[PDB]
Amino acid sequence: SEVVSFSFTKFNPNPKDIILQGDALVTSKGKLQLTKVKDGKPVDHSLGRALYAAPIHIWDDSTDRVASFATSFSFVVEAPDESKTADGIAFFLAPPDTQPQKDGGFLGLFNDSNKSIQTVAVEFDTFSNTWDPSARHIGINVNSIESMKYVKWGWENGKVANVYISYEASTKTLTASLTYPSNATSYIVSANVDLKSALPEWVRVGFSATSGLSRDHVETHDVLDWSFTSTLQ
Amino acid sequence: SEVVSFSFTKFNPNPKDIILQGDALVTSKGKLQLTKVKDGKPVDHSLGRALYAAPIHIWDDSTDRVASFATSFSFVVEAPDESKTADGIAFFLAPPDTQPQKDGGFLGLFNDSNKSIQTVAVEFDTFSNTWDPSARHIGINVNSIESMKYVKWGWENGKVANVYISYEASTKTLTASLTYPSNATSYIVSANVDLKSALPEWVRVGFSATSGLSRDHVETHDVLDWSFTSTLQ
Amino acid sequence: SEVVSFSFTKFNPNPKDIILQGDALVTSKGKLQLTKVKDGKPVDHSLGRALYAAPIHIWDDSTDRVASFATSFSFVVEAPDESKTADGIAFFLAPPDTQPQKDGGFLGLFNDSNKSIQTVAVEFDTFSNTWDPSARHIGINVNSIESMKYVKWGWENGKVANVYISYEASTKTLTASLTYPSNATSYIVSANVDLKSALPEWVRVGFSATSGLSRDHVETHDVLDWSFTSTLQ
Amino acid sequence: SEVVSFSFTKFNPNPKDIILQGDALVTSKGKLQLTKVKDGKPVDHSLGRALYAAPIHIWDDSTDRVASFATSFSFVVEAPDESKTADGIAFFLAPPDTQPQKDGGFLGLFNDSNKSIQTVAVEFDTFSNTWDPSARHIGINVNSIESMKYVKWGWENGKVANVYISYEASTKTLTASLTYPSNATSYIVSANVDLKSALPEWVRVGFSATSGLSRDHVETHDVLDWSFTSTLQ
Numbered sequence: 001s002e003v004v005s006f007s008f009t010k011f012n013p014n015p016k017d018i019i020l021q022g023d024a025l026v027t028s029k030g031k032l033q034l035t036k037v038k039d040g041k042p043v044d045h046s047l048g049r050a051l052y053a054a055p056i057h058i059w060d061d062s063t064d065r066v067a068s069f070a071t072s073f074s075f076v077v078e079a080p081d082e083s084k085t086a087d088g089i090a091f092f093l094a095p096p097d098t099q100p101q102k103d104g105g106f107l108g109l110f111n112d113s114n115k116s117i118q119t120v121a122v123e124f125d126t127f128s129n130t131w132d133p134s135a136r137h138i139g140i141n142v143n144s145i146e147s148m149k150y151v152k153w154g155w156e157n158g159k160v161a162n163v164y165i166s167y168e169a170s171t172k173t174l175t176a177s178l179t180y181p182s183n184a185t186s187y188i189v190s191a192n193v194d195l196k197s198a199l200p201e202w203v204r205v206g207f208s209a210t211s212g213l214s215r216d217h218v219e220t221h222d223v224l225d226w227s228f229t230s231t232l233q
Numbered sequence: 234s235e236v237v238s239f240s241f242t243k244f245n246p247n248p249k250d251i252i253l254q255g256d257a258l259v260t261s262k263g264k265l266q267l268t269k270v271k272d273g274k275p276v277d278h279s280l281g282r283a284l285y286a287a288p289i290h291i292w293d294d295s296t297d298r299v300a301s302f303a304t305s306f307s308f309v310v311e312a313p314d315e316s317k318t319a320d321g322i323a324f325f326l327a328p329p330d331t332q333p334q335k336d337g338g339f340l341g342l343f344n345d346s347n348k349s350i351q352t353v354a355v356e357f358d359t360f361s362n363t364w365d366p367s368a369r370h371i372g373i374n375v376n377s378i379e380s381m382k383y384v385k386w387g388w389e390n391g392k393v394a395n396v397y398i399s400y401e402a403s404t405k406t407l408t409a410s411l412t413y414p415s416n417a418t419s420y421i422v423s424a425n426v427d428l429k430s431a432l433p434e435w436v437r438v439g440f441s442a443t444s445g446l447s448r449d450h451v452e453t454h455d456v457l458d459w460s461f462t463s464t465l466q
Numbered sequence: 467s468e469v470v471s472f473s474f475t476k477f478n479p480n481p482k483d484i485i486l487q488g489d490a491l492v493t494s495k496g497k498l499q500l501t502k503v504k505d506g507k508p509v510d511h512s513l514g515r516a517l518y519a520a521p522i523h524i525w526d527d528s529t530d531r532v533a534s535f536a537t538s539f540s541f542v543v544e545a546p547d548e549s550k551t552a553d554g555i556a557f558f559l560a561p562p563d564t565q566p567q568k569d570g571g572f573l574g575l576f577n578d579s580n581k582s583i584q585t586v587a588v589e590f591d592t593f594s595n596t597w598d599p600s601a602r603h604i605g606i607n608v609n610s611i612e613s614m615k616y617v618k619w620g621w622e623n624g625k626v627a628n629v630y631i632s633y634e635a636s637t638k639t640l641t642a643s644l645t646y647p648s649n650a651t652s653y654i655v656s657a658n659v660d661l662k663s664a665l666p667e668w669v670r671v672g673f674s675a676t677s678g679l680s681r682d683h684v685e686t687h688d689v690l691d692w693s694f695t696s697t698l699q
Numbered sequence: 700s701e702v703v704s705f706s707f708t709k710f711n712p713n714p715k716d717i718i719l720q721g722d723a724l725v726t727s728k729g730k731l732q733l734t735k736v737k738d739g740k741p742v743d744h745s746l747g748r749a750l751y752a753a754p755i756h757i758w759d760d761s762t763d764r765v766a767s768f769a770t771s772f773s774f775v776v777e778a779p780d781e782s783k784t785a786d787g788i789a790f791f792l793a794p795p796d797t798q799p800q801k802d803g804g805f806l807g808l809f810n811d812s813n814k815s816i817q818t819v820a821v822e823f824d825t826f827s828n829t830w831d832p833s834a835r836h837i838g839i840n841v842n843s844i845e846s847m848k849y850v851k852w853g854w855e856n857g858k859v860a861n862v863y864i865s866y867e868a869s870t871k872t873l874t875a876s877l878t879y880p881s882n883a884t885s886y887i888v889s890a891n892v893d894l895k896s897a898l899p900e901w902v903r904v905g906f907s908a909t910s911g912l913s914r915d916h917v918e919t920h921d922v923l924d925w926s927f928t929s930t931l932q
């Protein structure tokens with residue numbers, strides 16, 4: 001068997017075991033700032049991703065086994081105007097050499113063309129695109145910006161959101177939950193996801209986020225902490 | 234600091250680090266059978282509880298600190314008739330010397346009289362009593378059979394339910410979630426619970442369950458696995 | 467499988483998941499004081515033991531498997547006079563209902579009569595009895611006060627000793643090591659121990675210590691911290 | 700704080716979270732073969748290293764803190780002739796971009812010139828060079844092929860050696876132990892090592908090994924398993 005685990009109470013300003021992509025950076029105070037902020041205000045047309053350094057062995061073709069994993073992180077999405085927000089933040093798995101994809105509604109995870117890339121993600125969508133449901137939502141996405149399953153999400157502006165995500169290999173069940181401690185409000189969505197068929201044997205895990213493509217659709221996407229463990233046997 | 238953790242993939246037929254109360258027993262196959270089964274059929278007027286041997290330090294008066302904990306267990310509730318079920322199963326914390334309370338709708342956790350006992354529990358209620366909401370539910374209960382918060386629960390007869398419960402001391406947030414891998418269906422409920430004011434410094438953690446008080450309101454309450462960790466600092 | 471683990475950075479003055487036996491108590495500062503101290507000076511004819519509350523499943527007759535475990539603790543032995551010391555302190559496993567045995571050189575673990583009790587222990591002996599080697603030693607003991615294997619031990623008066631003990635089930639190897647960080651000095655002893663044949667399926671783990679039987683052979687036996695994990699599969 | 704941990708019961712033939720350097724490879728059976736083997740026989744002039752993918756934060760200049768870590772691995776060194784062996788294998792820490800250094804007696808870790816590189820290592824030396832003690836030894840090395848402290852090591856040809864290494868930041872104590880389960884024989888060495896002064900803030904951890912520079916001084920250097928955890932607070 002192979003177990004791999006890591007836990008940050010906060011992030012290090014120059015983090016060597018976190019690959020920073022796009023505009024992602026860690027603040028002096030140890031927040032993982034996924035999207036751009038200038039003069040303490042979020043900027044549009046921004047995209048940032050962060051991956052853990054060590055690839056995670058999620059399945060093995062030789063032994064035909066699949067990994068079960070669990071991760072918990074807290075994040076904040078703040079927007080100067082509650083009514084106009086975009087685009088969102090997501091936890092995702094992708095091939096180790098994964099690079100930022102389309103910005104805006106694609107969340108830096110997906111793009112177009114039949115050549116849709118291997119990426120499984122739990123997204124926290126704050127903007128209803130043409131492929132979305134009408135209200136803000138938490139979606140389970142499998143190789144597409146369109147969620148296979150989702151649950152309506154009462155986003156709370158600027159409030160800390162605690163997230164727990166677990167994948168049970170034995171039942172191919174991916175579950176994702178969000179709780180705002182502020183008002184003890186929760187949401188959850190689960191889906192049957194075959195990882196072997198959606199992703200390669202090894203993957204990198206992390207976060208991706210994008211601010212909106214207009215000045216009036218901006219917000220922050222900061223990750224405050226992160227714990228993650230995966231076991232393959 | 235003090236960390237305490239334990240993990241059973243299944244239970245041992247004669248388990249010395251599990252205190253069995255009432256009719257609770259572990260089957261040869263390693264299932265924690267909370268309620269009575271005779272000829273493979275659940276019997277009425279049954280009550281069983283199971284606690285971990287070692288008390289858990291959840292708060293300390295001297296250092297004024299509170300513990301954060303997390304537990305995951307999978308359970309099955311099977312009833313010969315879908316329409317008539319009772320009463321339920323619950324994960325709970327109570328003083329170390331805790332003993333079974335009222336049966337039936339009280340879930341072996343609570344009883345009557347102003348002398349209501351110290352017990353915090355996440356309950357999986359399958360019968361609507363006079364103090365319940367109308368439909369089956371997952372409730373957060375604080376020193377009362379009446380839930381402070383609850384979420385409607387689409388109970389699936391005989392199907393495995395995976396549960397994750399976490400308490401974040403820093404925000405006094407208790408969250409409880411249920412997912413049926415069978416059909417990737419989920420439910421979640423969270424509540425602000427001050428543990429210091431509801432329970433003593435040390436507690437025992439475990440499960441409690443009761444079958445209905447009539448022959449036509451019977452079901453099983455089996456726990457298949459259990460992991461639990463708590464840290465106090 | 468079944469995993470069980472606990473970690474104290476220090477002890478709680480009134481510890482509910484530590485069974486205190488004999489004169490053992492935890493000080494206000496959180497030290498596990500195994501032997502008696504009066505006016506800050508160790509007293510003779512003292513014996514104290516401490517066990518973790520939850521029994522540990524070390525082997526299972528049905529599945530014919532044995533547990534692998536590992537524990538680390540730091541301890542101090544202080545004596546007003548370097549030349550005259552007694553008797554020692556030990557980490558040990560014994561049946562769950564284990565009670566203090568003979569004092570003095572028997573370390574509160576063993577006694578006489580063909581009815582020698584089931585107890586495996588790693589002892590830190592500070593007095594050469596008739597059954598001991600001549601110099602102070604770390605011994606692996608299997609159902610006898612006489613060590614099966616030992617290594618000469620350069621005891622450092624009043625200095626912190628860090629101990630790591632591990633049992634590898636697959637090779638029936640018990641290893642015990644001591645390091646004084648003060649002067650980076652180390653000692654180690656290992657032995658082939660069949661746990662199934664020496665102890666029952668379930669056991670309690672902990673510490674035992676005794677001061678000498680004369681006024682001029684006194685010392686303290688304090689445990690400062692303790693971590694312990696055991697897995698059975 | 701930041702915790703990082705990983706555990707392999709064995710290695711994966713194409714391991715993406717293990718950087719393989721020099722001649723190092725993983726066999727079909729999952730052994731980490733550090734040095735070359737041709738027709739099942741070890742070859743001379745060989746050097747192989749393996750590092751974990753994710754850098755480890757061992758100290759932080761801003762917060763002036765140091766990490767405590769612990770690792771356990773089992774390894775085998777087999778030589779066709781007991782009397783003539785070389786050179787050895789070592790666990791080591793070095794800057795993340797670390798590359799193989801001199802072969803032979805330098806163990807792929809060190810080389811010459813005042814420009815001696817930052818590398819701390821626990822070495823299992825099977826050949827007495829001009830800078831070594833006379834007999835085979837386990838050495839603690841700090842930025843030099845010459846060990847600061849060592850203990851004579853009774854190497855057992857072809858037998859499994861279990862190793863436990865721990866660094867206690869609070870006392871700057873590095874301890875390294877070896878036990879042969881075959882005959883319950885142990886060795887240990889500890890040293891006061893200031894990591895902040897010997898290595899940069901971030902490092903990569905892993906193994907390095909070299910076979911001798913002559914045909915009659917050859918042996919294997921295989922790692923069978925590996926667990927490692929480090930916490931910085």
Ligand SMILES: CC(=O)N[C@@H]1[C@@H](O)[C@@H](O)[C@@H](CO)O[C@@H]1O
Pocket residue numbers: 086087103104105106127129211212213214217
């Ligand atoms: C395709 C795409 O990303 N569309 C974006 C949408 O996601 C949102 O950010 C909007 C804000 O004005 O700008 C565009 O419409």
Ligand SMILES: CC(=O)N[C@@H]1[C@@H](O)[C@@H](O)[C@@H](CO)O[C@@H]1O
Pocket residue numbers: 319320336337338339360362444445446447450
């Ligand atoms: C107070 C109480 O437990 N009432 C019980 C209720 O919980 C349910 O089990 C019912 C089934 O016929 O029997 C009684 O009404």
Ligand SMILES: CC(=O)N[C@@H]1[C@@H](O)[C@@H](O)[C@@H](CO)O[C@@H]1O
Pocket residue numbers: 552553569570571572593595677678679680683
């Ligand atoms: C049998 C026995 O415990 N003998 C004790 C010995 O252990 C030591 O404590 C000594 C000190 O004067 O007192 C007695 O001889």
Ligand SMILES: CC(=O)N[C@@H]1[C@@H](O)[C@@H](O)[C@@H](CO)O[C@@H]1O
Pocket residue numbers: 785786802803804805826828910911912913916
């Ligand atoms: C400097 C150096 O590595 N010297 C090596 C020594 O380590 C050993 O391998 C020997 C075997 O014949 O070959 C050389 O002397």
Ligand SMILES: [Ca+2]
Pocket residue numbers: 087088105125126127128129132
């Ligand atoms: Ca969207």
Ligand SMILES: [Ca+2]
Pocket residue numbers: 320321338358359360361362365
């Ligand atoms: Ca009810």
Ligand SMILES: [Ca+2]
Pocket residue numbers: 553554571591592593594595598
């Ligand atoms: Ca003695």
Ligand SMILES: [Ca+2]
Pocket residue numbers: 786787804824825826827828831
């Ligand atoms: Ca050498």
Ligand SMILES: [Mn+2]
Pocket residue numbers: 123125132139145146147
């Ligand atoms: Mn979406």
Ligand SMILES: [Mn+2]
Pocket residue numbers: 356358365372378379380
């Ligand atoms: Mn209820």
Ligand SMILES: [Mn+2]
Pocket residue numbers: 589591598605611612613
């Ligand atoms: Mn002895």
Ligand SMILES: [Mn+2]
Pocket residue numbers: 822824831838844845846
């Ligand atoms: Mn050397």
